[PDB]
């Protein structure tokens, strides 16, 4: 018994060259696409602390995202070497340009 | 005795179990020698060597008195692809001559 799983990040191309054809199902791996998952997401993680994390929340509660996990991890390193009092608005700066077009 | 060489072609939509059905009619044949060219005993192999390989069996065939042969998956044998479109010629041709060459007498 032989058991293959396949990843990619293209799927037209694949359809185009005839190849879904060949395997047997697909699974869809989707985006953060929520301010609670977010939220959720830097709570488990423990970079940014409790006032830091209300502000956050003020700012970004009201609205949609469109973010990758291992892009998320980059944004926070990136945000941490500014001063102690610079940080979050680096932070938001940063997921604003950033840009969704889902 | 005045065609001693015939061919068939079966064709169909994709899952509809071809090769399966070609295998049973070329068992029941009861003929004294049969063959499958299947391509995926030549995983890799450029051109030239998939040439060789079908003239081989063509010739093992040739051979004996009475025989049948089966090929499978023709679209994969020759590399076809909808974009461009992309083949080997050299497997073309070979097949297009292959298909009208009569064996020796009597056979
Ligand atoms: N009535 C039937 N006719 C043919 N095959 C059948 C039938 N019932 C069950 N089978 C089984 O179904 C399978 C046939 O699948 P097969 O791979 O031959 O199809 P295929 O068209 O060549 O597929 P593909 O297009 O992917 O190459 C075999 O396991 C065969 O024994």
């Given at each position: 018994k032989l058991l293959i799983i396949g990843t990619t990040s293209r799927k037209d191309v694949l359809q185009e060259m005839e190849?879904?054809?060949?395997?047997?199902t697909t699974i869809h791996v989707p985006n953060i696409a929520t301010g609670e998952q977010l939220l959720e997401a830097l709570e488990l993680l423990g970079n940014f602390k409790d006032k830091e994390r209300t502000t956050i929340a003020q700012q970004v509660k009201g609205k949609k995202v469109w973010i990758g996990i291992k892009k998320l991890l980059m944004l926070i390193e990136m945000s941490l070497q500014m001063d102690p009092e610079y940080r979050v608005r680096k932070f938001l700066a940063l997921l604003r340009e950033e840009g969704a077009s889902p | 005795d005045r065609t001693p060489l015939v061919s068939v072609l079966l064709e169909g939509p994709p899952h509809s179990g071809k090769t399966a059905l070609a295998a049973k009619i070329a068992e029941e044949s009861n003929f004294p020698f049969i063959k499958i060219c299947s391509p995926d005993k030549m995983i890799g192999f450029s051109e030239t060597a998939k040439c060789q390989a079908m003239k081989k069996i063509f010739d093992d065939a040739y051979k004996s008195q009475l025989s049948c042969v089966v090929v499978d998956d023709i679209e994969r044998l020759l590399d076809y692809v909808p974009i461009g479109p992309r083949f080997s010629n050299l497997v073309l041709q070979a097949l297009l001559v292959l298909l009208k060459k009569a064996p020796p007498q009597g056979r």
């Open positions: 190849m879904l054809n060949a395997f047997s | -």
